[PDB]
Amino acid sequence: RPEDLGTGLLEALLRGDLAGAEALFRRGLRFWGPEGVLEHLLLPVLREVGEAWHRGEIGVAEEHLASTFLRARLQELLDLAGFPPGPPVLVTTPPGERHEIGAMLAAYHLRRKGVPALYLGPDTPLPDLRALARRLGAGAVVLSAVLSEPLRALPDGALKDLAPRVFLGGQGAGPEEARRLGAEYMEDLKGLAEAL
Amino acid sequence: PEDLGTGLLEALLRGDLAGAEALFRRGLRFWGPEGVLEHLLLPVLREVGEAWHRGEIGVAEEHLASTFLRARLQELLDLAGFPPGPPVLVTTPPGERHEIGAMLAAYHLRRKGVPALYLGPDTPLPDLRALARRLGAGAVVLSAVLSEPLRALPDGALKDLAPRVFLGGQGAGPEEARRLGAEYMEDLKGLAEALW
Amino acid sequence: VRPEDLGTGLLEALLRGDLAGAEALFRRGLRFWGPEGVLEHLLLPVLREVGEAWHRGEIGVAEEHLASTFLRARLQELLDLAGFPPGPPVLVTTPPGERHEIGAMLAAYHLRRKGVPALYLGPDTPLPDLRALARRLGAGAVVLSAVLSEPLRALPDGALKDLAPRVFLGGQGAGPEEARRLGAEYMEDLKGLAEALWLPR
Amino acid sequence: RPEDLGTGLLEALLRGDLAGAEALFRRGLRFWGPEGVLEHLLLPVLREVGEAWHRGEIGVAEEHLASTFLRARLQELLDLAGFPPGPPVLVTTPPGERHEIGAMLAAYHLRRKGVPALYLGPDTPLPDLRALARRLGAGAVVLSAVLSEPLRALPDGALKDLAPRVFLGGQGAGPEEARRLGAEYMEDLKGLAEALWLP
Ligand code: B12
Ligand code: B12
Ligand code: B12
Ligand code: B12
Ligand SMILES: [Br-]
């Protein structure tokens, strides 16, 4: 039953039953819809994995396994959203940030609203990012920070003119760090599309 | 993979919906969203139609397969993004009961960032015109598999359904479109370009 | 708060072409009340309101189409979430001339929820073709949904009698007298259809 | 058209035409099939991207974009190969190795041969990897190294007893470094499943 899908998915992953995990995920998709399954299945399982690690019950390998699975499910949804033409929004994470899920969520929410979000993958050097934005005439750059340490490593103003609009979010980011870096801060992914 | 079409058709004809669903999903993984329509859904649909037209299968078997494929397309349709802004209304001419062409058109538009509202088939023109006007629709798109429903319409019938009116499907040709006051397009890939 | 309270919001979302909003509201209803709840207390009441509003001339065919297509899509989703078990199927359709799908889809859904392999063919299946498919697949039953009475009236006495070992007819277009004339078993309760099949558990 | 697919795909990616890149990739699939498209399209384009970067013709962002696309196509094929039951083989890259494609190829070739290859993602610390292998009762661990420096940083015997069988490959690896690390070395992915089954 739905309230038990999260537990089932997590237990499936922890015993290496990818087939079973995939079926459970698909059930979640059918029940909650695309946005629903992200809010009520993907994120809760990801958090529980994190909490289990933070508590010492599993290691990085189990975490990697679950993240890779969920990244694959999200990439599927990303390609089902389609990719509109027109000036792209480049989506990535700060240098040193290897966690991808936040960035992919942001790209997904934009693409569902008809915004051409180009997900680059994580960990993009800022000069290279600036150059690509300029060449493709990107309207915005969007950064997801799960950890605060990668943002702390950046100098003041580092994000300031990557693109006409620069957005920073994720639990690793706050309004003060965004201001220091010269980015706009946003808490809700659902409002990122509206903001553009 | 070049065997997915045969497998799907045989699965449907023996009423193995579970197997047909898996095969369809394989086709999705392999060919992508637009690809599975070109390489799996439409070929199977046509083979079913041809088999019926040849007298090899009965209406019930055909219905079963068509209903399945309609359901798979509706799934993909709702997985696509839906932007805000003036909608494009998508339907079929009065008397045209076949849905898949219209659904394809709506899907290809939604993938390209166009807010295509699929109404279902068989919409009377005054009612269609009124809805377009009320919602401030930028366009109406009609899919005609049969030519007879178009033939029954008076000259100019489609001319003012919305600021732009497109007619396609194998039931339509450039001369019939001109007679009816619609713009003709053969390729769905060019419909999105024509709007943006 | 009850499911039918969301009906006005859902319908108004649909009528202004806010598909995202309509979908979200429907999904909320699903989370809160569950599938059977939302079907009985949101989907059907809204479908009827749409129909009545059309029958009264308050909305045009296009708006009605839009709403019906939306509700059909939500029901098809639930239908495919119920899964498809193995075993001899039950074929679900509507009589020739009957284009309305929702009743048939409901019947298929309630069977599938109870572990019965209900094959929904779509609507409007000729009887000899239906009989042939039932025979080939070794179907235990056929289920017919009739919203209109005229399609049933057009059929000869006994026409439904031997489509399969069991044949069930329902929908507001059907009554017990017409079912008896046609040789079908008449059935009002969707939740009791599986039980009526006399299968294990 | 086939002889033009690689150039077309690369140019599509470099101008951020994901729709066009996806179609071109699908054409490659129609021509060459699943295994074919990897040898004739995915890998050549990946290498050309790399070479173009190494030559200074594109920046990291363009490379990231193309690699992310190709990673997505490979993950698709990986999950199409299916996942059999039975004791898994864990597939990853050494600590410090962020490149994924080699590992994904290895997992794919195993899965095609009916081996349950669990791709973990890249860059797994060895104690954590050891623990997961133990928990899942994995018969083998497979590591793909494109860079040599991450292997050089590892202590002697570091890969020994991650499972009863441990394989190391990729251009970053050679037989001498594998022996030092306590892994078995191999070059050809088409032989890897057979090499795991047999002694
Ligand atoms: C999972 C998790 C991890 C995972 C991260 C990988 C993964 N699986 O995603 C792993 C295992 C790596 C991890 C470990 C650590 N992480 Co941790 N862990 C978590 C946990 C449980 C969830 C984080 C999470 O929600 N991630 C999913 C992302 C997508 O959600 P999100 O970042 O909150 O972002 C949301 C929004 O901001 C928005 N969003 C995301 N991106 C963007 C971008 C834009 C533009 C916008 C508008 C919105 C947006 O969408 C998201 C969902 O709504 C939290 C605890 C908790 N929150 O309950 C911590 C937590 C974040 N971790 C913490 C940290 C920093 C760590 C550690 C360094 C601490 C340690 N014990 O060593 C380690 C080391 C990191 C490393 N070396 O890899 C601490 C933070 C404390 C602090 N700030 O000092 C937390 C808060 C735990 C705690 N309560 O103490 N962690
Ligand atoms: C499948 C099929 C059926 C199926 C329908 C399945 C279903 N949809 O539920 C069934 C078996 C029901 C059927 C029956 C009939 N159909 Co029939 N059958 C076909 C068949 C084999 C394929 C049709 C098809 O490709 N559909 C899929 C659609 C999407 O393809 P499409 O219309 O070509 O559209 C493409 C493009 O135009 C574009 N597109 C679509 N819409 C739009 C819109 C725009 C704006 C744009 C830009 C692009 C675009 O995308 C599509 C794919 O690339 C063809 C024969 C053939 N080989 O083509 C006939 C055909 C269409 N059928 C035909 C006939 C005669 C019938 C019947 C009337 C036969 C009869 N006497 O009873 C019945 C009608 C039933 C009714 N309800 O009225 C004729 C039509 C002749 C005509 N009118 O000119 C055809 C051509 C067969 C023939 N050669 O005689 N048929
Ligand atoms: C909605 C509706 C429509 C909608 C249909 C929406 C849709 N896409 O499905 C629209 C607007 C299209 C419509 C139009 C028409 N319909 Co109308 N409308 C209705 C309405 C309001 C409700 C029908 C309904 O409840 N549908 C849902 C189904 C599932 O409900 P149900 O059949 O009662 O079934 C219940 C149970 O029997 C059970 N069930 C269903 N099937 C089965 C099977 C089994 C085995 C079991 C156990 C149980 C079961 O499930 C349901 C639970 O409540 C009624 C009037 C009313 N207030 O009831 C008419 C009504 C059915 N319509 C009617 C008419 C006349 C029409 C039109 C012909 C009007 C016209 N002039 O063109 C058209 C028909 C077009 C055509 N195809 O020929 C008449 C039918 C008269 C008759 N048949 O004798 C009605 C009764 C209105 C009237 N009093 O005049 N209609
Ligand atoms: C593509 C590439 C990149 C790409 C990576 C793209 C990507 N997303 O993977 C990019 C542009 C990022 C790149 C950059 C760098 N790379 Co580079 N580039 C290459 C290139 C052109 C090809 C590598 C390749 O083919 N990878 C794909 C994999 C699958 O191929 P493979 O490892 O040969 O594996 C084959 C087999 O071994 C088998 N296989 C793979 N794994 C396994 C496992 C097992 C068990 C088995 C049996 C078989 C097997 O499958 C493959 C055949 O189909 C080579 C140059 C060349 N001509 O080879 C370098 C090369 C690997 N790069 C190199 C360097 C130096 C770098 C950088 C460190 C440069 C720098 N920044 O200073 C960075 C890395 C930055 C970092 N630390 O993260 C060096 C490595 C030197 C060394 N290892 O001693 C090379 C050799 C170039 C050179 N001549 O200097 N590179
Ligand atoms: Br009900």
CATH match of B3-79 with 3.40.50.10790: no
Write the residue with the smallest CA distance to atom 17 of ligand 4.
D50
A39 CB near ligand 1 (under 6 Å): no
CA end-to-end span of chain A, whole Å?
Answer: 38
For residue B107 and ligand 2, the question of a CB distance below 6 A is answered with: no
> Chains D, C in contact: 3+ Cβ pairs under 8 A?
no
> Is C136 part of any known ligand binding site?
no
Quick check: A129 and D61 CB within 8 A?
yes
- Number of residues that make up chain B: 196
Q: Rounded CA gap, B7 and B2, in Å?
A: 10
* Pairing outcome for strands C185-186 and B164-168: unpaired
Handedness of CA B120, B123, B125, B126 (dihedral sign): negative
Q: Does domain A89-195 have CATH number 3.40.50.280?
A: yes
Cα–Cα distance measured from residue B97 to residue A114, given in angstroms and rounded to the nearest whole number: 30
Residue found by looking up tokens 């802004």 in the block: B85
The strand pair at C166-170 and C141-145 is best described as parallel
SS3 state at C141: strand
The total of other beta-carbon atoms located within 10 Å of residue B133's CB is 12
Pocket of ligand 4, beta carbon within 6 A = D 43, 46-47, 50-51, 53-54, 63, 67, 98-99, 101-102, 105-106, 142, 144, 146-148, 167-172, 186, 189, 192
Cβ contacts of B89 on chain C, cutoff 8 Å: 62
Q: Would you say the CB of residue A63 lies under 6 angstroms from ligand 1?
A: yes
**How far is residue A136's CA from residue C110's CA, in Å, rounded to a whole number?**
53
Minimal CA separation from D77 to chain B, in Å:
7
How many A-C residue pairs are in contact by the CB < 8 A criterion?
14
Q: Which CATH number fits domain C3-82: 3.40.50.2300, 1.10.1240.10, 2.60.120.1440, 1.20.1740.10?
A: 1.10.1240.10
Residues B90 and B105: beta-carbon distance below 8 Å: yes
**To probe the interface with D, which of A132, A135, A136 has the most D CB atoms within 10 Å?**
A132
Integer Cα distance of C109 and C115 in angstroms: 10
| Approach to solving | X-ray
Q: Any bridge partners for residue C50, and if so which? A: none
Ligand 3, atom nearest to C47 Cα: 1
State which CATH number among 1.10.1240.10, 3.90.1150.10, 3.40.50.360, 3.40.50.300 fits the domain covering A2-81: 1.10.1240.10
The vertex-D48 CA angle with D43 and D52, nearest 5°, equals 150
Quick one: which atom of ligand 4 is closest to the CA of D148? 83
User: CA–CA distance from C80 to each of B15, C25, C109, C110 (Å)?
Assistant: 14, 20, 8, 12
What is the rounded distance in angstroms from the CA atom of residue D88 to the CA atom of residue D85? 8
Q: Smallest Cα–Cα separation from D80: which of A70, B28, B34, B73? A: B28
- Determine the angle formed by the axes of helices B125-135 and C61-81, rounding to 10 degrees: 80
C70 in Cβ contact with C35 (< 8 Å): no
By alpha-carbon position, which residue is closest to atom 13 of ligand 2? B49
> Most B CBs within 10 Å: which of A26, A38, A80, as the mutation test of the B interface?
A80
For domain B88-195, give the CATH number: 3.40.50.280
CA distance D127 to A32: 38
Q: Which CATH architecture has domain C90-197?
A: 3-Layer(aba) Sandwich (3.40)
What's the CATH fold of domain D89-197?
Answer: Rossmann fold (3.40.50)
Answer whether A111's CB lies under 8 Å from A137's CB. no
Domain boundaries, chain D: 2-81, 89-197
Please tell me the number of Cα atoms within 13 Å of C130 on its side-chain side. 29
For helices C127-137 and B59-79, the axis angle rounded to 10 degrees is 80
Question: Ligand 2 center to residue A63 CA distance, Å?
Answer: 50
Q: What is the DSSP string of chain D?
A: -GGGHHHHHHHHHHTT-HHHHHHHHHHHHHHHHHHHHIIIIIHHHHHHHHHHHHTTSS-HHHHHHHHHHHHHHHHHHHHHS---SSS-EEEE--TT----HHHHHHHHHHHHTT--EEE--S---HHHHHHHHHHHT-SEEEEE-S-SHHHHTSPTTTTTTSSSEEEEESTT--HHHHHHHT-EE-S-GGGHHHHHH--
